[PDB]
Design a binder for this molecule. Sequence first.
Ligand SMILES: [Ca+2]
Ligand SMILES: [Ca+2]
Ligand SMILES: [Mg+2]
Ligand SMILES: [Mg+2]
Lengths: 12, 12, 235, 235
Amino acid sequence: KLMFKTEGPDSD
Amino acid sequence: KLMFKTEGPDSD
Amino acid sequence: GAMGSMERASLIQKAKLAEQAERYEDMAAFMKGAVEKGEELSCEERNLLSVAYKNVVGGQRAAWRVLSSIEQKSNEGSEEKGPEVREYREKVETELQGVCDTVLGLLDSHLIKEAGDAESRVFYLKMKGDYYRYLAEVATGDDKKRIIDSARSAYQEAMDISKKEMPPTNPIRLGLALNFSVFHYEIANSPEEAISLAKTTFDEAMADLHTLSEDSYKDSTLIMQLLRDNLTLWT
Amino acid sequence: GAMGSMERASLIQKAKLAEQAERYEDMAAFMKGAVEKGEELSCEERNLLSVAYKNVVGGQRAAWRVLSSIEQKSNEGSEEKGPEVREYREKVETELQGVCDTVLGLLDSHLIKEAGDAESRVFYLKMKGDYYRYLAEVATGDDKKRIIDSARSAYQEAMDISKKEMPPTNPIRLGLALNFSVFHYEIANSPEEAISLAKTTFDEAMADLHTLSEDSYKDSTLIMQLLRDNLTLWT
Ligand SMILES: [Ca+2]
Ligand SMILES: [Ca+2]
Ligand SMILES: [Mg+2]
Ligand SMILES: [Mg+2]
């Protein structure tokens, strides 16, 4: 899935 | 530490 | 609690070591122990708590998405392979829900109720929205609507406080708006609300950058770029 | 065993799903369950077992090295910070040793004794050498010499079989020689032996490449490049 930017560690 | 190449997944 | 015998300061110190070692499950367990000491958390400690659980749940979310995609493909001319994909997706899902419940439990007992300053209260309410959002990503049953509304309500209270008490460039306020905009886009099926929130947040921050030091400017513009990244994908 | 109620084939299927999801602890637990069914493992299943535990122990080794480096710095004008670094290094170390003991236990009960074909026996003896080598990386006490000799003995038996029964380009033979050469360099304090082994292995493989299909050639040259990489660092 295309994940949009959310705050903090892009850990997924 | 400088790790030398060992077989399989370079997982460390 | 397994951390009940360890000093608060030692738990914090070990959380920082765990971060350096990329041992995020350990980091989260240490920070849970620190929260359970019952004292409020400093700004640095709040960020350790958030980084730890964000990394843990992030790995679970990524794994869940891989397994869900395989499961969906199996339900399309696809050969029957038995219950294993569903079972393993459910296993990862249950563990993910458990982590979200753990974080929500720390927020409810008793981080939020003791948080009176805007920076702490907004931070924790944003976290509450985030972890209900992660629950919503995997929800399919009769409680999905209530889970979504719990995320919305937490984000909305955080937004109301942040607009009253924080400047538009405050990084907590910006990260909250970023995440609430993604909630609108991905969870609430409200892409126009997502776009409007991201645009207004970006523009109001832009207009306030002139008040900031070089270091604060860097902090704020980093998050503004994330808003822009999403707007570019959405428009 | 928590996997005792799951079918062997389901454990294998879930190990492959776990790999796709980068859930290596799950993958290792599934493969341990499969081994404990008591049947021999196919080539593909052996590789799943190895990949799973290699990834798990690799994360532990990397974390241990971070913590050990911090601990060593603390023992140099350095400010006293209490027992926490040592404690947390010891925690990670104990977990790492536990994983190594688990793998060694599977090999001893009863993978090695049932392995009669060269490909399986060499594979398992190489694994035995590897996991004693990982124990040796963290050993400091009165058993370090015996741990080192256990790694050496397993590697040596694997080498003897591989030279008798496998061509010099066989990827298992090549990966064994690569790892035994690193053992010599890093563990046994024998850099000349390491260099000689890597060079002879590389040269004898080179001379046998002409016998191989395109796909086998690719498999063998990949590992040969790792030998070359080490030789470049060592000479
Ligand atoms: Ca105390
Ligand atoms: Ca059966
Ligand atoms: Mg204010
Ligand atoms: Mg042969």
